[PDB]
Design a protein around this ligand. Structure first.
Ligand SMILES: [Mg+2]
Ligand SMILES: [Mg+2]
Ligand SMILES: [Mg+2]
Ligand SMILES: [Mg+2]
Ligand SMILES: [Mg+2]
Ligand SMILES: [Mg+2]
Ligand SMILES: [Mg+2]
Ligand SMILES: [Mg+2]
Ligand SMILES: [Mg+2]
Ligand SMILES: [Mg+2]
Ligand SMILES: [Mg+2]
Ligand SMILES: [Mg+2]
Ligand SMILES: [Mg+2]
Ligand SMILES: [Mg+2]
Ligand SMILES: [Mg+2]
Ligand SMILES: [Mg+2]
Ligand SMILES: [Mg+2]
Ligand SMILES: [Mg+2]
Ligand SMILES: [Mg+2]
Ligand SMILES: [Mg+2]
Ligand SMILES: [Mg+2]
Ligand SMILES: [Mg+2]
Ligand SMILES: [Mg+2]
Ligand SMILES: [Mg+2]
Ligand SMILES: [Mg+2]
Ligand SMILES: [Mg+2]
Ligand SMILES: [Mg+2]
Ligand SMILES: [Mg+2]
Ligand SMILES: [Mg+2]
Ligand SMILES: [Mg+2]
Ligand SMILES: [Mg+2]
Ligand SMILES: [Mg+2]
Ligand SMILES: [Mg+2]
Ligand SMILES: [Mg+2]
Ligand SMILES: [Mg+2]
Ligand SMILES: [Mg+2]
Ligand SMILES: [Mg+2]
Ligand SMILES: [Mg+2]
Ligand SMILES: [Mg+2]
Ligand SMILES: [Mg+2]
Ligand SMILES: [Mg+2]
Ligand SMILES: [Mg+2]
Ligand SMILES: [Mg+2]
Ligand SMILES: [Mg+2]
Ligand SMILES: [Mg+2]
Ligand SMILES: [Mg+2]
Ligand SMILES: [Mg+2]
Ligand SMILES: [Mg+2]
Lengths: 97, 187, 52, 52, 147, 52, 122
RNA sequence: GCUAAAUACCGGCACGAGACCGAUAGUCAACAAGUACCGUAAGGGAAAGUUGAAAAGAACUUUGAAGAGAGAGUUCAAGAG
RNA sequence: ACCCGACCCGUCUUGAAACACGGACCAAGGAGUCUAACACGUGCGCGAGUCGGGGGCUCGCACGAAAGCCGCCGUGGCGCAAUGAAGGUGAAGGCCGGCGCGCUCGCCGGCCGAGGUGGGAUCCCGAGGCCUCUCCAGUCCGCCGAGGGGCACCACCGGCCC
RNA sequence: AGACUAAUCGAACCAUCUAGUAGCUGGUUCCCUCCGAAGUUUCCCUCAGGAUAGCUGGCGCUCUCGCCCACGCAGUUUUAU
RNA sequence: CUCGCUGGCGUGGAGCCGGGGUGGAAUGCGAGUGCCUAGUGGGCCACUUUUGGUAAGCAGAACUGGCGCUGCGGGAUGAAC
RNA sequence: CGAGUAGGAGGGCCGCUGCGGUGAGCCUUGAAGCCUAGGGCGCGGGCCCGGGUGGAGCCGCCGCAGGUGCAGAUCUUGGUG
């Protein structure tokens, strides 16, 4: 009943099939595991943003807002828009003798 | 050989609807004409949703459609929901708003037409706004299925908000070992 | 035996049920027995009402 | 016994005739109408096969 | 339909879709719920948490019969009556009010949500909840118990 | 013997099917497409008298 | 609702033949034989078919009346043509092109009127 | 202390129906099947349907003692004896 | 006939032409079924509802052991409401003012009534120029900087019930 | 002598329960097109097996590229640390 | 601007509101995300690095590739070169 | 762009047998089967055509339903080397 015990032979090849997906970017990081006395300040700080300020801050924004030449030449000939008088001379152009 | 790359070559996107409904098969014949010939991107999105299945076209309840039409600047556009529009008896006001759906439910047809509004479908919708001009698109709560609260990381690990499968709720069903702290562990 | 996420199913099939199964294929026949039992009760009586 | 869409079916329970998926269903008459073929892009009929 | 199966596709193949190596035999991990505590705890826990043990008081001869009270909320509260009456309760009259009875429709306890119709009412019920009773006092309505 | 022989169907869908199958029997293209001989027949649905 | 009739009948009709090859329409009013949308003659309000002449010589042409639908006795009006293989070629061109009556399927009417005389003339 | 009903019936007496099986299937049994035959016995338990429209089942001639054949005939056919 | 290629198939197996096993040769028979239950997925009907599944009505008409109807047959099932061992309780806030030391602080009156931030298909407003002399004028097609109300949904904050 | 007890004995024979159970051997019936691995972790009276992850397949869904600078990603370097 | 935390300090720090400029190494690519689930759960060989052995076509590993799951051309022939 | 065991999906005008529908289908002027140095079609599953045998029923297409497809099990029964 003797067997083999532990090998990470062919584990590099399994992990990188789908790939090492790096989480790296998201916004507004989750707010668990936070120091609770800090949070026992900040929820109060949010509830008086609504109640405590309309007239002071919105008008304060209102105050500060009231405070506030040959090879260069053929591209102009052969441009799609800027060349219709370029054709003043080959089509109906001035050239003539 | 070529690839030291894999093969994820074939997309899974649905192309013809699995349904055999003739009337859906005529709205597809009409709308597959439009989405290639208009340089419009509304007509892409409706043509996707006619393909789409019945799970992924959840029904608008009537008061979502009101509350998403009274939002400012949108009193004058016509609502388009691909899928069914049902009735809400929670509400009392019904304004004169415009509705364009597949299979408005019957008690919802009366409460529109009491309110003097106008109903359309996609044979009629194509004539007014072929490009979808002036038309708000909506859709129902796709995650709002009952099932989608079952789907999480596991049903026990940091409690994960899972709604486990059980033959009925009560005492004496999945409560002792894991659902409380005195009887072993508390997940 | 159990596997990926599914409900614990305890059916009562350890007891050898196939000997003791009443099958309802006699269900249209009894229904026609019993209309013709009530109607046989209808024309026996007289003026007195059935379910009288 | 089946009723119109406007009235009920005055011989059954609660069965109006079931509401429709399309109303006006002439596919060709819709697609040749002035509303659509003003709004369309252009047709495109050249083939442009494999250039050697 | 035996003509739409997987069996009818897998003829011609040897192991019939159950593996040469592992050999689908009879009942490998036991029958049914065998070894929940012993060798299927990673299944029972992590998928059915709390399946083993006791929590509460026993109740003998539990009838579903002295705990019968179908609820209602104040959304559906107007939906028992024809809405003929809520027009004729809005018809500028006085404090006259429809006497909506929830006991007729089967609903004993009236729970609450927000946002009840402005027009005054009288609800006749067996049980109330004080948030809902705060809502009926908001609109100037009344709150009558039936026994 | 206790195979699931009989199938139950919703009462609105049955009535939906009668509503649809009656609707096919008013178009001569569909009814000749089933195989019937209507080439010299009187106009479709064809109401004969209650004297019949 | 002609396309409604098509989306029922385009399979599962009667007189539809699927043996060894393509479908065939085999329908009493049709020019070519294909089970197609355009060469299908129960569906359309305006259909063109030509047939043989049971008189023995000539080509009979079948057109739908367009006045009364769902009235299949009176819904067809027919007329025979027995001419000198060139005037009966133009007359069927005049009757198709110089009306709005199906400017599609011009040639398929003619090729059958081409073919059925050559079966009939010797 | 007694008492009809609706309820139950893979035995028995008649009976109609089948999206069934069609002789290695279906009952074990389409047939002289619980039989032939094995075991002292308790018990076990098979196989075996098909001529033709009709027997018209090949008179007679001819080798061998006959089996078996060549001629002949009956049959639409003896490539159904 | 000949050149070159060429070990006998199933099977377990790290490996089978194997000195591994089964396989003399043909014909027929022959092995993932059905009932229940749960789960996801998908088609169809209805929609805060749904369901006749058990009964009754049709005349007793071959197919009818079918089908059709009921609705003061919706009893009930499943769903709409949760949480607690249990007694039990059981889900609306936002805006403009007022009263007290207007504070670790709650109450009084109107007015809409499901919050907010970042993302966010589609839709709308679009400066702006673009097409034969020139002015002089409205439709018009297409491009359109930037801006706007923002679906489904995800990440986060607030709130409410036990 | 563990012998003999109907060619059967360290517990006869016959029929039922019984189609007993098996993580163990053997077999598992038509073609074509696409995709295509594992023998590793942890725990189990676990060591010839399962549970769970890993690996595989399928079905979808939500978007973006079609036009002096994009968004995003990585078995890679470069520049810092 | 808010704070009920901090505090000589209108200070510390978070939070909220409004305004102003998109261009911040190379390279390649279309990405993101949910459900259900089979099979698997006896492995083996090779360059270098390695532990037990006198040594092994031995026993145990790490990193990578392969045989397994895979023919073809070379090594006469062969699972891995 | 194409490899593929275990495996999972898709397409099949591939075959067998039974049921509603249709083919004004088919046939004692020869159906089923079976044989065939006969003519072909399909990548393939399998089919169509001719000839020979036999002598009474059978097949297409759209749906429906399977006790539905063999080289293997020291396969069962039958039969011959
Ligand atoms: Mg191991
Ligand atoms: Mg290649
Ligand atoms: Mg399992
Ligand atoms: Mg038992
Ligand atoms: Mg296989
Ligand atoms: Mg193993
Ligand atoms: Mg297995
Ligand atoms: Mg248990
Ligand atoms: Mg007594
Ligand atoms: Mg026989
Ligand atoms: Mg027998
Ligand atoms: Mg006879
Ligand atoms: Mg003699
Ligand atoms: Mg004969
Ligand atoms: Mg071998
Ligand atoms: Mg040996
Ligand atoms: Mg061998
Ligand atoms: Mg042998
Ligand atoms: Mg066979
Ligand atoms: Mg479902
Ligand atoms: Mg009820
Ligand atoms: Mg001894
Ligand atoms: Mg003896
Ligand atoms: Mg012994
Ligand atoms: Mg067995
Ligand atoms: Mg038995
Ligand atoms: Mg046994
Ligand atoms: Mg591949
Ligand atoms: Mg182990
Ligand atoms: Mg083994
Ligand atoms: Mg995948
Ligand atoms: Mg499988
Ligand atoms: Mg696994
Ligand atoms: Mg070794
Ligand atoms: Mg292997
Ligand atoms: Mg590989
Ligand atoms: Mg190799
Ligand atoms: Mg070689
Ligand atoms: Mg060598
Ligand atoms: Mg070799
Ligand atoms: Mg391949
Ligand atoms: Mg055939
Ligand atoms: Mg055939
Ligand atoms: Mg059968
Ligand atoms: Mg079988
Ligand atoms: Mg085999
Ligand atoms: Mg054998
Ligand atoms: Mg012998």
């Amino acid at each position: 009943a003797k067997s083999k015990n532990h090998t990470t032979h062919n584990q590099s090849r399994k992990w990188h099939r789908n790939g090492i997906k790096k989480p790296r970017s998201q916004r507004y990081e989750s707010l668990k595991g936070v120091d609770p006395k800090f949070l026992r300040n900040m929820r109060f700080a949010k509830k008086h943003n609504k109640k405590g300020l309309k007239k002071m801050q919105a008008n304060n924004a209102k105050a500060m807002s009231a405070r506030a030449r040959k090879l260069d030449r053929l591209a102009y000939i052969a441009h799609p828009k800027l060349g219709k008088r370029a054709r003043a001379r080959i089509a109906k152009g001035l050239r003539l003798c | 050989g070529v690839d030291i790359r894999h093969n994820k070559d074939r997309k899974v996107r649905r192309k013809e609807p699995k349904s055999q409904d003739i009337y859906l098969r005529l709205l597809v014949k009409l709308y597959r004409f439009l989405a290639r010939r208009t340089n419009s991107t509304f007509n892409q999105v409706v043509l996707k949703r006619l393909f789409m299945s019945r799970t992924n076209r959840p029904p608008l309840s009537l008061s979502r459609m009101i509350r998403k039409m009274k939002l400012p600047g949108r009193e004058n556009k016509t609502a388009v929901v691909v899928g069914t529009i049902t009735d809400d008896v929670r509400v009392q006001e019904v304004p004169k708003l415009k509705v364009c759906a597949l299979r408005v439910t019957s008690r919802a047809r009366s409460r529109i037409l009491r309110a003097g509004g106008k109903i359309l479908t996609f044979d009629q919708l194509a004539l007014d706004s072929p490009k979808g001009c002036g038309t708000v698109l909506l859709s129902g709560p796709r995650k709002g299925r009952e099932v989608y609260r079952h789907f999480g990381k596991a049903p026990g690990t940091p409690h994960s908000h899972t709604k486990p499968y059980v033959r009925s709720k009560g005492r004496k069903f999945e409560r002792a070992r894991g659902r409380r702290a005195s009887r072993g562990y508390k997940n | 035996a159990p596997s990926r996420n599914g409900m614990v199913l305890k059916p009562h099939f350890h007891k050898d049920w196939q000997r003791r199964v009443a099958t309802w294929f006699n269900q249209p026949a009894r229904k026609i027995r019993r209309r013709k039992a009530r109607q046989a009760k209808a024309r026996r009586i007289a003026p007195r009402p059935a379910s009288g | 016994l089946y009723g119109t869409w406007r009235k009920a079916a005055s011989l059954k329970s609660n069965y109006n005739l079931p509401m429709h998926k399309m109303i006006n269903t002439d596919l060709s008459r819709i697609l040749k109408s002035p509303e659509i073929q003003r709004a369309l892009r252009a047709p495109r009929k050249k083939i442009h096969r494999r250039v050697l | 339909p035996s003509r739409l199966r997987k069996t009818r596709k897998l003829r011609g193949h040897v192991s019939h879709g159950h593996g040469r190596i592992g050999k689908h035999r009879k009942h490998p991990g036991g029958r049914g719920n065998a070894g929940g505590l012993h060798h299927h705890r990673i299944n029972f826990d992590k998928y059915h948490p709390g399946y083993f043990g006791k929590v509460g008081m026993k109740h003998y001869h539990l009838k579903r019969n002295q705990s019968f009270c179908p609820t209602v909320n104040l959304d559906k509260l107007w939906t028992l009556v024809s809405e003929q009456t809520r027009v004729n309760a809005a018809k500028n009259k006085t404090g006259a009010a429809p006497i909506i009875d929830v006991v007729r429709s089967g609903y004993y306890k009236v729970l609450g949500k927000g946002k009840l119709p402005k027009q005054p009412v009288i609800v006749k019920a067996k049980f109330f909840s004080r948030r809902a009773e705060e809502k009926i006092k908001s609109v100037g309505g009344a709150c009558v118990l039936v026994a | 013997t206790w195979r699931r022989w009989h199938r139950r169907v919703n009462t609105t869908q049955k009535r939906y099917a009668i509503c649809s199958a009656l609707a096919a029997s008013a178009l001569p293209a569909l009814v000749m497409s089933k195989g019937h001989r209507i080439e010299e027949v009187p106009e479709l649905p064809l109401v004969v008298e209650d004297k019949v | 609702s002609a396309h409604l009739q098509w989306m029922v009948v385009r399979n599962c009709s009667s007189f539809l033949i699927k043996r060894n090859k393509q479908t065939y329409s085999t329908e009493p009013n049709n020019l070519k034989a294909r089970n197609s949308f355009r060469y299908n003659g129960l569906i359309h309000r305006k259909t063109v078919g030509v047939e043989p002449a049971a008189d023995g010589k000539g080509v009979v042409v079948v057109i739908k009346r367009r006045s009364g639908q769902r009235k299949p006795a009176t819904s067809y009006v027919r007329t025979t043509i027995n001419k000198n293989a060139r005037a009966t070629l133009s007359s069927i061109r005049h009757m198709i092109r110089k009306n709005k009556y199906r400017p599609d399927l011009r040639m398929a009417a003619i090729r059958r009127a081409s073919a059925i005389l050559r079966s009939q003339k010797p």
